[PDB]
Amino acid sequence: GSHSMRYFYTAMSRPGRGEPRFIAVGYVDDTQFVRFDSDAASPRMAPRAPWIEQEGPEYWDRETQISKTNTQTYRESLRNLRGYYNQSEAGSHTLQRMYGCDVGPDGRLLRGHDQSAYDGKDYIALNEDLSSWTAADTAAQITQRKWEAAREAEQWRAYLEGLCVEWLRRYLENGKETLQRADPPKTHVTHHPISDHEATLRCWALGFYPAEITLTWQRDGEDQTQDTELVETRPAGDRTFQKWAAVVVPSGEEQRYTCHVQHEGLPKPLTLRWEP
Amino acid sequence: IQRTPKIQVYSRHPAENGKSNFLNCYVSGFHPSDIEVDLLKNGERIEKVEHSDLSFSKDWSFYLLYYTEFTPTEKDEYACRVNHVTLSQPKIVKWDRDM
Amino acid sequence: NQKLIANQF
């Protein structure tokens, strides 16, 4: 199907505790494959997936040099941002960036992404046209003006339509036995009496990849969206994900409830019931 | 501004007493990124705990997985203990093998 | 493959 690659940057200032920390992680779909941390004893861009390890030393030298340059740029940007918001130099602040590209089954660019947040708030984003910016406030308008004069949008378009998709295609071929394998959820329903009056039906999906999944309870064929407790999809630690959805049902009415599961790895969507 | 962490404690594989497994504490939805997480066995800090590299969701909130190897039993109690700027006290969430 | 980011905010 479709695939994405994303880099996630976080820069955190910490006055009185050294210079701002810079962390970068790269993902293909839901698989992390590199990390950089400026706080590591010997900061360098490091592998986190087996299929990236075949890249040669020129690869790792380049990625490390980019991360070190980005560390310095992000430190300067944090200083600039503090000034744009008239903030004290005693406070901690966060600058986040996430960028990358989405490709379709044929490897063609679906769209590119580049957006930024300051203290958890959207700050500036490259528009889908890859040629203009949406600035959140008057501070981000200063950044927009700087980037308009530095021809930033043009450089992002060249990267997102060129290098980004070419490397994603390369990663997808090198990691094809995992990146291009969907693992379906193992599913089942558990039953947890609450009282004489009610019990919890809990529908489980385990061991699936990628993380995108739809898990819904119906009562008499009608979705129970307002009455379903749905936990956030969570990593198992072994590449795969877990999720459950629960409804509180009247005792003796369990068979009126069905759990419906949709996932890319399933030949056909599943319908499950409590099976006592 | 500030968002307090969501916390899930769970095992990698379905728990079977006496069989080695992995205990996970997934913290997500929080901002800013500094967070303190301890895994506990009968109330005592487990020493060998690993964690994922910091990343964040589409709403910019951070998430981390803390994990350790463990062997469940009927008597042993496991928990995750979390502190964050948003919490006046550390929050402890006990492992329930059915969740 | 990362982008080289040299334009400050």
Numbering used by the authors:
A (entry chain A): 1 to 276
B (entry chain B): 1 to 99
C (entry chain C): 1 to 9
Paper text:
We tested for association of five HLA loci with disease course and identified a strong association between HLA-B*15:01 and asymptomatic infection, observed in two independent cohorts. The crystal structure of HLA-B*15:01–peptide complexes demonstrates that the peptides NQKLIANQF and NQKLIANAF (from OC43-CoV and HKU1-CoV) share a similar ability to be stabilized and presented by HLA-B*15:01. We crystallized each peptide in a complex with HLA-B*15:01 and solved their structures at high resolution.
